[PDB]
Amino acid sequence: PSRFTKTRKHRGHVSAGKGRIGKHRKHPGGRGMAGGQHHHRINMDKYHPGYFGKVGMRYFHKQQAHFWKPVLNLDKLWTLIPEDKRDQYLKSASKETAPVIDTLAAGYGKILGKGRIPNVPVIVKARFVSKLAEEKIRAAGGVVELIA
Amino acid sequence: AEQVAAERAARKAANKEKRAIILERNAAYQKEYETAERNIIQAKRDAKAAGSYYVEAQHKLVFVVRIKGINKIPPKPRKVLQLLRLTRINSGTFVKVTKATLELLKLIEPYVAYGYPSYSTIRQLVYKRGFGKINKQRVPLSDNAIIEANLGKYGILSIDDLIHEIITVGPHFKQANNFLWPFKLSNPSGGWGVPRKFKHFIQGGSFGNREEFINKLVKSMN
Amino acid sequence: RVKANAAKRAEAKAQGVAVQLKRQPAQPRESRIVSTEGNVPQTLAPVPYETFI
Amino acid sequence: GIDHTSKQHKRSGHRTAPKSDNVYLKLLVKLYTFLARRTDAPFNKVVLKALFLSKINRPPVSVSRIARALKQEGAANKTVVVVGTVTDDARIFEFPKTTVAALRFTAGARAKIVKAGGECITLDQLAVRAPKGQNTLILRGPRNSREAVRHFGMGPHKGKAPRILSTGRKFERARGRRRSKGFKV
Amino acid sequence: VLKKNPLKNKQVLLRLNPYAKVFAAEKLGSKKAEKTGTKPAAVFTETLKHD
Amino acid sequence: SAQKAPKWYPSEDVAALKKTRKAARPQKLRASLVPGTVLILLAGRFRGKRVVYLKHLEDNTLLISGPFKVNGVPLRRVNARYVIATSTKVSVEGVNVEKFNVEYFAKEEIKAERVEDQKVVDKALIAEIKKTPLLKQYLSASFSLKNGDKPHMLKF
RNA sequence: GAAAUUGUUGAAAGGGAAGGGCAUUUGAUCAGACA
RNA sequence: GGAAUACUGCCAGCUGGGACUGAGGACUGCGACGUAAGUCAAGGAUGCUGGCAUAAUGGUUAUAUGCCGCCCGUCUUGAAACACGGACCAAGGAGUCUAACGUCUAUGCGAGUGUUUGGGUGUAAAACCCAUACGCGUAAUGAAAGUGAACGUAGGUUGGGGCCUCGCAAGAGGUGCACAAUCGACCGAUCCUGAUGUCUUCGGAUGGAUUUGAGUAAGAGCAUAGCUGUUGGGACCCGAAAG
RNA sequence: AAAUAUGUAAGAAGUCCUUGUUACUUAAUUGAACGUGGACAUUUGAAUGAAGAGCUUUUAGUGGGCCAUUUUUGGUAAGC
RNA sequence: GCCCUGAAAAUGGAUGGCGCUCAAGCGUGUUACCUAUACUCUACCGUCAGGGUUGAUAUGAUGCCCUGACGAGUAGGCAGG
Ligand SMILES: [Mg+2]
Ligand SMILES: [Mg+2]
Ligand SMILES: [Mg+2]
Ligand SMILES: [Mg+2]
Ligand SMILES: [Mg+2]
Ligand SMILES: [Mg+2]
Ligand SMILES: [Mg+2]
Ligand SMILES: [Mg+2]
Ligand SMILES: [Mg+2]
Ligand SMILES: [Mg+2]
Ligand SMILES: [Mg+2]
Ligand SMILES: [Mg+2]
Ligand SMILES: [Mg+2]
Ligand SMILES: [Mg+2]
Ligand SMILES: [Mg+2]
Ligand SMILES: [Mg+2]
Ligand SMILES: [Mg+2]
Ligand SMILES: [Mg+2]
Ligand SMILES: [Mg+2]
Ligand SMILES: [Mg+2]
Ligand SMILES: [Mg+2]
Ligand SMILES: [Mg+2]
Ligand SMILES: [Mg+2]
Ligand SMILES: [Mg+2]
Ligand SMILES: [Mg+2]
Ligand SMILES: [Mg+2]
Ligand SMILES: [Mg+2]
Ligand SMILES: [Mg+2]
Ligand SMILES: [Mg+2]
Ligand SMILES: [Mg+2]
Ligand SMILES: [Mg+2]
Ligand SMILES: [Mg+2]
Ligand SMILES: [Mg+2]
Ligand SMILES: [Mg+2]
Ligand SMILES: [Mg+2]
Ligand SMILES: [Mg+2]
Ligand SMILES: [Mg+2]
Ligand SMILES: [Mg+2]
Ligand SMILES: [Mg+2]
Ligand SMILES: [Mg+2]
Ligand SMILES: [Mg+2]
Ligand SMILES: [Mg+2]
Ligand SMILES: [Mg+2]
Ligand SMILES: [Mg+2]
Ligand SMILES: [Mg+2]
Ligand SMILES: [Mg+2]
Ligand SMILES: [Mg+2]
Ligand SMILES: [Mg+2]
Ligand SMILES: [Mg+2]
Ligand SMILES: [Mg+2]
Ligand SMILES: [Mg+2]
Ligand SMILES: [Mg+2]
Ligand SMILES: [Mg+2]
Ligand SMILES: [Mg+2]
Ligand SMILES: [Mg+2]
Ligand SMILES: [Mg+2]
Ligand SMILES: [Mg+2]
Ligand SMILES: [Mg+2]
Ligand SMILES: [Mg+2]
Ligand SMILES: [Mg+2]
Ligand SMILES: [Mg+2]
Ligand SMILES: [Mg+2]
Ligand SMILES: [Mg+2]
Ligand SMILES: [Mg+2]
Ligand SMILES: [Mg+2]
Ligand SMILES: [Mg+2]
Ligand SMILES: [Mg+2]
Ligand SMILES: [Mg+2]
Ligand SMILES: [Mg+2]
Ligand SMILES: [Mg+2]
Ligand SMILES: [Mg+2]
């Protein structure tokens, strides 16, 4: 609010904190992103390398959705089972009856391997896996089942 | 609860015990000092008798008074004045003379007055304007327990012990001397004795080594 | 100085200490008695102005 | 005059209270400055200051960072103390017993700790059980994990991440970022 | 609350330094030094009055 | 309310004084003030009057008298710092004086005893004054600074 | 029913401006505190 | 030959005149003097006496007198300037709001977070309640197709508050979060290597490299709010010649 | 070949003994680099000083300057 | 060495003025004396720092209490009002 504001505090001084010499004027270095390759270049390189020019291929009419594919790491993975049920599967880790986790149903497109699941067997249903995710999942006695 | 007198017993007897130690220590020093002077006197007299010249040891202690104000002072001497703790006009400190402080003294000759202080004026400096540095906080000397609490570790458990460490430039002159806040002196009472302060003592000015003539100045200032 | 400092430290300890091995600045001079024998003082005075040229 | 050797009237730089207005915070502080003035235990002095800290200088400690610390040699029965909030972590499956004293426990954190038959204690309860912080392990969280510090020290060859809104090819990835386009950083 | 100069103020003079009492008792500040009469070698005098 | 209300008031309890260390010791007078000595009064009702000094009262004042029959001044208190002590003395060795103290002048016209005391003290003084010619006349004439007189030079 | 600005009345100062600072004399005026 | 004196210096030698101050408010300290009882000038003034009790002292004011004092505001290296504005007075009169932001801070919740497009409900623009989505965050790296984070107690080394053990203590050892420095490992890109195999050209295991990334390495974010700062806007207020 | 000015050093991140690691390097277990284990504490390695030291973020104004001693260029000179 | 000549400009006029001649001038020496917002001691304000103090049954814990040092300021920053 205005009450807490330096302009209340500048009342009575001449230059409003803007200086007597340099003044406060309209648009000294130009407006907006003006000057980029000229009098504002030092700031642009440093702070914004990369800014001018092009890289890579244009893609006309790109539809994000095409590329929708959220990742989940083994890291979690057991999170996709509600906890009441989790402990029941954690202990009695087995074939014959291992949990089915539908990672697409949870809204994930790829399973990745960040790290360490307990030795319990999981049946993991997913669209994609990372070679490691599968290796690890298997060393616990589970499988990946590829869905769509 | 006893303590009433019961621990006022320890205290008073122990305090009594200390003044005893201080009493005999100050007797010692006074013998030490007066045979020290007498020896040098008979030195000179014996040397003349033999057809020779007794040349005294060079002074080991000087006493420096900043005689110059705080403006327009070149960097190099400015730093030295800081390190000697002379950061305002008329304040002074003691300095142990070695090659490595001579050269300090040299760099500041135009801003200071210094010389060889006598027992009398080290004594009256400390009795009157002597202040310890204690968790900073500049604290007046006024009671011997103040001294023993901060310099006891070095022997030195009284005000005349302190003086004794100073004048004889003892093994603990650094701790002892640093303990003393720089002395804040007044302007000389009967004045400077000269029309212009800022030339050397030798040219009818006030700055530089005036050797034993420092005692007259500092007394007039103290 | 190190290699030496180790030595006089051994030479002390082994003996029964009292070392002192920090360097120290030039100290002022001690007293001394200069004799006159063979060496009475020569008196000099300042010398007059002269030109050579 | 004095040829001053250092700035005059300089404030120490350190908080002295917290900036917070929370009564209960101020009460804990009432407690701990007492403890700090009268116990000569160093634990209390450290805790006093941490109570003053702003939210950034007290990152959350996760319950898994707690489990690690209890794995130190001779540390398992220590009561871990956190002057801040304690957060949950599904990445650890097996979480030990212990006693954690902290300012805040998230719902899932006290659950995990309590499900293992451990205990959540507030700082004043800690004070009473351990007036000198006996048998205590203080944990702090990662301060320089914050997104803000990514961008500190931006400049050529420093490798520090643009302040940028959109990202993608075609945002700040051409002249100055690759050898073939002017130069590289 | 008030610095008292010893130097003037016998009370604290004696509180600091207890030797002050015997120092003044035995005068000591006016000690008579032993009269000795050693005489300087001619050499010393000769070169004193030399031109 | 008109004004709010402080959240802290001063206590109205008054402290005791600290235990001060200030012995009253006797005022020793300057050597020139010896009973029998003639004083010049410098101020007061009797300013300029030359007068005989009798006793040092317990309140530091000086008991003097004219004598009354010479110059009109009675047994009376005078302050030692408003007085010039001359060098002329009458012996005061037959003048009683024991009676006279601070209470004798407790303020509380002239009581018959004062009238009477005055005469007993003055007849002795007059006896002594007669021994030195012109002293009475001296005692009955006022002192004044004359043109050219320099007190810092004059002997009194 | 403000101010600038004006009339009258009363008081004061004024040898080429006036106004201001520190200090006191003199005049006018007034609070407090005593019990 | 024997003294004196001057000069310089010393005394915790004695002593006179004058000026300014009297902060503090029970006691508590360090002492001094006494055979003692006690006393004191020893951690900041008390004792005694008088005058007035009021315009006396004091405040305010006008004037006089001593000394001193150039018009402010502005731009400027430099203004009292022979630089500009301002005869006088009232009243108006200039850093704002908004979109999106950086840092810092407070608060809620936390691997999440955000009820307010909307629905429900109402004492009706409020307050109260809520389903599905969505947004930011929880993954990175490539121009891309694409691939995608543990050799190891999630590593070694050095410093490291705190805690733990021994010790009366000083110290010694144990553990060491944050943070810092340094050497490695992990993921992507680049380059190299090219196993078992094959719809004989697909496949790309494995081990590597002064290369390279805004990465991993027991998460820190999301939201609301504030000061300051950023860009667009009439953009602190007033001002062109023009189009 | 000065004077003034100027780089580095004055220890625990040190010094010594023992002998592990490698694909580097040597004729060579030779060296080199990093280590394990062991020995010596504050006169532990000059002076003086230190209202402590280190570190992080963010942002204002500024980006006409002028003067004096000394050194000093152009100019006859200059309040250049 | 001092003094003198050499030595010419514009309104009347400046060792600051008056005036000063064994100086109140020039060179040098010796004392004393005058006086800055500086130095010394003290009170009071504020700023920074270091201590002490939750024990109720009375009133400010951002409080109270002790102690030390410090204070110029345009542009500008922040703070308490
Ligand atoms: Mg705003
Ligand atoms: Mg407001
Ligand atoms: Mg305001
Ligand atoms: Mg301001
Ligand atoms: Mg201001
Ligand atoms: Mg203002
Ligand atoms: Mg300003
Ligand atoms: Mg500004
Ligand atoms: Mg302006
Ligand atoms: Mg572009
Ligand atoms: Mg993850
Ligand atoms: Mg000069
Ligand atoms: Mg020194
Ligand atoms: Mg004198
Ligand atoms: Mg004198
Ligand atoms: Mg004088
Ligand atoms: Mg002169
Ligand atoms: Mg003096
Ligand atoms: Mg991250
Ligand atoms: Mg001769
Ligand atoms: Mg008493
Ligand atoms: Mg007396
Ligand atoms: Mg008559
Ligand atoms: Mg009307
Ligand atoms: Mg006026
Ligand atoms: Mg006035
Ligand atoms: Mg008082
Ligand atoms: Mg008082
Ligand atoms: Mg009245
Ligand atoms: Mg009256
Ligand atoms: Mg009037
Ligand atoms: Mg004037
Ligand atoms: Mg202007
Ligand atoms: Mg100009
Ligand atoms: Mg101006
Ligand atoms: Mg002009
Ligand atoms: Mg203009
Ligand atoms: Mg005009
Ligand atoms: Mg207005
Ligand atoms: Mg309702
Ligand atoms: Mg409605
Ligand atoms: Mg729906
Ligand atoms: Mg991608
Ligand atoms: Mg491929
Ligand atoms: Mg290593
Ligand atoms: Mg250790
Ligand atoms: Mg270790
Ligand atoms: Mg890689
Ligand atoms: Mg690349
Ligand atoms: Mg990124
Ligand atoms: Mg990102
Ligand atoms: Mg703008
Ligand atoms: Mg137009
Ligand atoms: Mg137009
Ligand atoms: Mg056009
Ligand atoms: Mg150097
Ligand atoms: Mg250097
Ligand atoms: Mg030091
Ligand atoms: Mg310090
Ligand atoms: Mg800046
Ligand atoms: Mg800048
Ligand atoms: Mg700039
Ligand atoms: Mg400019
Ligand atoms: Mg200059
Ligand atoms: Mg002339
Ligand atoms: Mg003159
Ligand atoms: Mg002369
Ligand atoms: Mg004279
Ligand atoms: Mg003053
Ligand atoms: Mg002062
Ligand atoms: Mg200021």
PDB file of all heavy atoms in Angstrom, chain H residues 56-63:
ATOM      1  P     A H  56       9.651  41.974  40.575  1.00  0.00           P
ATOM      2  OP1   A H  56       8.714  42.458  41.648  1.00  0.00           O
ATOM      3  OP2   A H  56      10.340  42.967  39.689  1.00  0.00           O
ATOM      4  O5'   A H  56      10.734  40.987  41.250  1.00  0.00           O
ATOM      5  C5'   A H  56      11.984  41.435  41.759  1.00  0.00           C
ATOM      6  C4'   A H  56      12.712  40.322  42.470  1.00  0.00           C
ATOM      7  O4'   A H  56      11.791  39.623  43.354  1.00  0.00           O
ATOM      8  C3'   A H  56      13.263  39.211  41.584  1.00  0.00           C
ATOM      9  O3'   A H  56      14.469  39.538  40.903  1.00  0.00           O
ATOM     10  C2'   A H  56      13.379  38.042  42.557  1.00  0.00           C
ATOM     11  O2'   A H  56      14.505  38.172  43.421  1.00  0.00           O
ATOM     12  C1'   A H  56      12.104  38.234  43.379  1.00  0.00           C
ATOM     13  N9    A H  56      10.984  37.474  42.771  1.00  0.00           N
ATOM     14  C8    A H  56       9.857  38.011  42.207  1.00  0.00           C
ATOM     15  N7    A H  56       9.033  37.121  41.717  1.00  0.00           N
ATOM     16  C5    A H  56       9.658  35.918  41.960  1.00  0.00           C
ATOM     17  C6    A H  56       9.250  34.622  41.652  1.00  0.00           C
ATOM     18  N6    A H  56       8.087  34.383  41.038  1.00  0.00           N
ATOM     19  N1    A H  56      10.081  33.613  42.009  1.00  0.00           N
ATOM     20  C2    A H  56      11.231  33.924  42.636  1.00  0.00           C
ATOM     21  N3    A H  56      11.721  35.119  42.974  1.00  0.00           N
ATOM     22  C4    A H  56      10.871  36.100  42.599  1.00  0.00           C
ATOM     23  P     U H  57      14.583  39.326  39.303  1.00  0.00           P
ATOM     24  OP1   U H  57      15.668  40.240  38.851  1.00  0.00           O
ATOM     25  OP2   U H  57      13.268  39.565  38.647  1.00  0.00           O
ATOM     26  O5'   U H  57      15.074  37.800  39.166  1.00  0.00           O
ATOM     27  C5'   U H  57      15.953  37.199  40.120  1.00  0.00           C
ATOM     28  C4'   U H  57      15.943  35.689  40.024  1.00  0.00           C
ATOM     29  O4'   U H  57      14.792  35.177  40.737  1.00  0.00           O
ATOM     30  C3'   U H  57      15.796  35.093  38.625  1.00  0.00           C
ATOM     31  O3'   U H  57      16.993  34.999  37.887  1.00  0.00           O
ATOM     32  C2'   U H  57      15.184  33.728  38.894  1.00  0.00           C
ATOM     33  O2'   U H  57      16.158  32.765  39.257  1.00  0.00           O
ATOM     34  C1'   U H  57      14.280  34.029  40.080  1.00  0.00           C
ATOM     35  N1    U H  57      12.900  34.293  39.612  1.00  0.00           N
ATOM     36  C2    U H  57      12.243  33.153  39.199  1.00  0.00           C
ATOM     37  O2    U H  57      12.761  32.042  39.235  1.00  0.00           O
ATOM     38  N3    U H  57      10.975  33.367  38.745  1.00  0.00           N
ATOM     39  C4    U H  57      10.331  34.576  38.660  1.00  0.00           C
ATOM     40  O4    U H  57       9.182  34.565  38.224  1.00  0.00           O
ATOM     41  C5    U H  57      11.080  35.724  39.080  1.00  0.00           C
ATOM     42  C6    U H  57      12.323  35.547  39.528  1.00  0.00           C
ATOM     43  P     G H  58      16.924  35.040  36.281  1.00  0.00           P
ATOM     44  OP1   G H  58      18.251  34.548  35.759  1.00  0.00           O
ATOM     45  OP2   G H  58      16.464  36.421  35.913  1.00  0.00           O
ATOM     46  O5'   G H  58      15.779  33.979  35.922  1.00  0.00           O
ATOM     47  C5'   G H  58      16.086  32.633  35.607  1.00  0.00           C
ATOM     48  C4'   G H  58      14.845  31.892  35.193  1.00  0.00           C
ATOM     49  O4'   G H  58      13.743  32.264  36.056  1.00  0.00           O
ATOM     50  C3'   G H  58      14.291  32.196  33.828  1.00  0.00           C
ATOM     51  O3'   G H  58      15.007  31.613  32.768  1.00  0.00           O
ATOM     52  C2'   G H  58      12.875  31.670  33.954  1.00  0.00           C
ATOM     53  O2'   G H  58      12.912  30.254  33.961  1.00  0.00           O
ATOM     54  C1'   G H  58      12.525  32.135  35.360  1.00  0.00           C
ATOM     55  N9    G H  58      11.831  33.439  35.385  1.00  0.00           N
ATOM     56  C8    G H  58      12.357  34.607  35.826  1.00  0.00           C
ATOM     57  N7    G H  58      11.557  35.624  35.742  1.00  0.00           N
ATOM     58  C5    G H  58      10.419  35.087  35.222  1.00  0.00           C
ATOM     59  C6    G H  58       9.208  35.730  34.914  1.00  0.00           C
ATOM     60  O6    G H  58       8.911  36.917  35.064  1.00  0.00           O
ATOM     61  N1    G H  58       8.290  34.841  34.381  1.00  0.00           N
ATOM     62  C2    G H  58       8.522  33.510  34.183  1.00  0.00           C
ATOM     63  N2    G H  58       7.501  32.834  33.661  1.00  0.00           N
ATOM     64  N3    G H  58       9.661  32.896  34.474  1.00  0.00           N
ATOM     65  C4    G H  58      10.563  33.746  34.993  1.00  0.00           C
ATOM     66  P     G H  59      14.896  32.310  31.342  1.00  0.00           P
ATOM     67  OP1   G H  59      15.872  31.692  30.411  1.00  0.00           O
ATOM     68  OP2   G H  59      14.900  33.776  31.530  1.00  0.00           O
ATOM     69  O5'   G H  59      13.398  31.958  30.917  1.00  0.00           O
ATOM     70  C5'   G H  59      13.055  30.718  30.307  1.00  0.00           C
ATOM     71  C4'   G H  59      11.619  30.714  29.861  1.00  0.00           C
ATOM     72  O4'   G H  59      10.819  31.329  30.884  1.00  0.00           O
ATOM     73  C3'   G H  59      11.325  31.548  28.640  1.00  0.00           C
ATOM     74  O3'   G H  59      11.623  30.899  27.429  1.00  0.00           O
ATOM     75  C2'   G H  59       9.855  31.894  28.797  1.00  0.00           C
ATOM     76  O2'   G H  59       9.032  30.837  28.337  1.00  0.00           O
ATOM     77  C1'   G H  59       9.727  32.005  30.308  1.00  0.00           C
ATOM     78  N9    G H  59       9.724  33.398  30.779  1.00  0.00           N
ATOM     79  C8    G H  59      10.723  34.051  31.461  1.00  0.00           C
ATOM     80  N7    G H  59      10.413  35.293  31.729  1.00  0.00           N
ATOM     81  C5    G H  59       9.117  35.444  31.225  1.00  0.00           C
ATOM     82  C6    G H  59       8.216  36.550  31.219  1.00  0.00           C
ATOM     83  O6    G H  59       8.358  37.670  31.670  1.00  0.00           O
ATOM     84  N1    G H  59       7.014  36.266  30.595  1.00  0.00           N
ATOM     85  C2    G H  59       6.701  35.058  30.042  1.00  0.00           C
ATOM     86  N2    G H  59       5.493  34.987  29.475  1.00  0.00           N
ATOM     87  N3    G H  59       7.524  34.026  30.040  1.00  0.00           N
ATOM     88  C4    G H  59       8.692  34.277  30.637  1.00  0.00           C
ATOM     89  P     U H  60      12.116  31.837  26.259  1.00  0.00           P
ATOM     90  OP1   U H  60      12.523  31.111  25.051  1.00  0.00           O
ATOM     91  OP2   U H  60      13.144  32.716  26.892  1.00  0.00           O
ATOM     92  O5'   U H  60      10.800  32.638  25.897  1.00  0.00           O
ATOM     93  C5'   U H  60       9.732  32.011  25.246  1.00  0.00           C
ATOM     94  C4'   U H  60       8.587  32.960  25.173  1.00  0.00           C
ATOM     95  O4'   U H  60       8.334  33.479  26.496  1.00  0.00           O
ATOM     96  C3'   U H  60       8.838  34.205  24.357  1.00  0.00           C
ATOM     97  O3'   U H  60       8.717  34.000  22.964  1.00  0.00           O
ATOM     98  C2'   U H  60       7.823  35.182  24.932  1.00  0.00           C
ATOM     99  O2'   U H  60       6.524  34.920  24.440  1.00  0.00           O
ATOM    100  C1'   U H  60       7.865  34.805  26.409  1.00  0.00           C
ATOM    101  N1    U H  60       8.760  35.681  27.180  1.00  0.00           N
ATOM    102  C2    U H  60       8.306  36.921  27.423  1.00  0.00           C
ATOM    103  O2    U H  60       7.249  37.315  27.043  1.00  0.00           O
ATOM    104  N3    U H  60       9.128  37.707  28.125  1.00  0.00           N
ATOM    105  C4    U H  60      10.354  37.382  28.592  1.00  0.00           C
ATOM    106  O4    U H  60      10.962  38.229  29.208  1.00  0.00           O
ATOM    107  C5    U H  60      10.785  36.078  28.303  1.00  0.00           C
ATOM    108  C6    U H  60       9.978  35.287  27.620  1.00  0.00           C
ATOM    109  P     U H  61       9.769  34.665  21.964  1.00  0.00           P
ATOM    110  OP1   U H  61       9.445  33.969  20.706  1.00  0.00           O
ATOM    111  OP2   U H  61      11.152  34.582  22.503  1.00  0.00           O
ATOM    112  O5'   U H  61       9.331  36.191  21.911  1.00  0.00           O
ATOM    113  C5'   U H  61       8.032  36.538  21.509  1.00  0.00           C
ATOM    114  C4'   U H  61       7.647  37.933  21.918  1.00  0.00           C
ATOM    115  O4'   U H  61       7.597  38.055  23.362  1.00  0.00           O
ATOM    116  C3'   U H  61       8.561  39.054  21.487  1.00  0.00           C
ATOM    117  O3'   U H  61       8.362  39.370  20.125  1.00  0.00           O
ATOM    118  C2'   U H  61       8.168  40.161  22.465  1.00  0.00           C
ATOM    119  O2'   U H  61       6.913  40.718  22.123  1.00  0.00           O
ATOM    120  C1'   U H  61       7.959  39.358  23.742  1.00  0.00           C
ATOM    121  N1    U H  61       9.190  39.231  24.527  1.00  0.00           N
ATOM    122  C2    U H  61       9.545  40.268  25.335  1.00  0.00           C
ATOM    123  O2    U H  61       8.886  41.281  25.389  1.00  0.00           O
ATOM    124  N3    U H  61      10.694  40.066  26.047  1.00  0.00           N
ATOM    125  C4    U H  61      11.480  38.940  26.016  1.00  0.00           C
ATOM    126  O4    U H  61      12.492  38.878  26.708  1.00  0.00           O
ATOM    127  C5    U H  61      11.021  37.901  25.173  1.00  0.00           C
ATOM    128  C6    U H  61       9.915  38.079  24.473  1.00  0.00           C
ATOM    129  P     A H  62       9.568  39.773  19.132  1.00  0.00           P
ATOM    130  OP1   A H  62       9.126  39.376  17.763  1.00  0.00           O
ATOM    131  OP2   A H  62      10.885  39.218  19.539  1.00  0.00           O
ATOM    132  O5'   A H  62       9.602  41.362  19.277  1.00  0.00           O
ATOM    133  C5'   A H  62       8.417  42.147  19.205  1.00  0.00           C
ATOM    134  C4'   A H  62       8.631  43.534  19.771  1.00  0.00           C
ATOM    135  O4'   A H  62       8.452  43.531  21.210  1.00  0.00           O
ATOM    136  C3'   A H  62      10.005  44.143  19.575  1.00  0.00           C
ATOM    137  O3'   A H  62      10.157  44.742  18.308  1.00  0.00           O
ATOM    138  C2'   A H  62      10.081  45.154  20.713  1.00  0.00           C
ATOM    139  O2'   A H  62       9.342  46.312  20.396  1.00  0.00           O
ATOM    140  C1'   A H  62       9.348  44.423  21.818  1.00  0.00           C
ATOM    141  N9    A H  62      10.298  43.644  22.605  1.00  0.00           N
ATOM    142  C8    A H  62      10.667  42.365  22.343  1.00  0.00           C
ATOM    143  N7    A H  62      11.558  41.897  23.168  1.00  0.00           N
ATOM    144  C5    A H  62      11.765  42.961  24.023  1.00  0.00           C
ATOM    145  C6    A H  62      12.617  43.070  25.116  1.00  0.00           C
ATOM    146  N6    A H  62      13.392  42.054  25.485  1.00  0.00           N
ATOM    147  N1    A H  62      12.635  44.243  25.780  1.00  0.00           N
ATOM    148  C2    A H  62      11.831  45.222  25.323  1.00  0.00           C
ATOM    149  N3    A H  62      10.984  45.238  24.300  1.00  0.00           N
ATOM    150  C4    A H  62      11.006  44.052  23.687  1.00  0.00           C
ATOM    151  P     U H  63      11.600  44.903  17.646  1.00  0.00           P
ATOM    152  OP1   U H  63      11.279  45.674  16.404  1.00  0.00           O
ATOM    153  OP2   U H  63      12.384  43.624  17.639  1.00  0.00           O
ATOM    154  O5'   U H  63      12.353  45.945  18.561  1.00  0.00           O
ATOM    155  C5'   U H  63      11.929  47.290  18.572  1.00  0.00           C
ATOM    156  C4'   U H  63      12.659  48.061  19.632  1.00  0.00           C
ATOM    157  O4'   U H  63      12.415  47.438  20.910  1.00  0.00           O
ATOM    158  C3'   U H  63      14.164  48.063  19.514  1.00  0.00           C
ATOM    159  O3'   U H  63      14.617  49.031  18.586  1.00  0.00           O
ATOM    160  C2'   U H  63      14.590  48.334  20.944  1.00  0.00           C
ATOM    161  O2'   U H  63      14.367  49.694  21.253  1.00  0.00           O
ATOM    162  C1'   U H  63      13.564  47.516  21.712  1.00  0.00           C
ATOM    163  N1    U H  63      14.012  46.128  22.004  1.00  0.00           N
ATOM    164  C2    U H  63      14.811  45.960  23.091  1.00  0.00           C
ATOM    165  O2    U H  63      15.134  46.893  23.752  1.00  0.00           O
ATOM    166  N3    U H  63      15.230  44.708  23.363  1.00  0.00           N
ATOM    167  C4    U H  63      14.898  43.601  22.649  1.00  0.00           C
ATOM    168  O4    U H  63      15.332  42.530  23.031  1.00  0.00           O
ATOM    169  C5    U H  63      14.046  43.819  21.538  1.00  0.00           C
ATOM    170  C6    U H  63      13.627  45.048  21.262  1.00  0.00           C
TER     171        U H  63
END
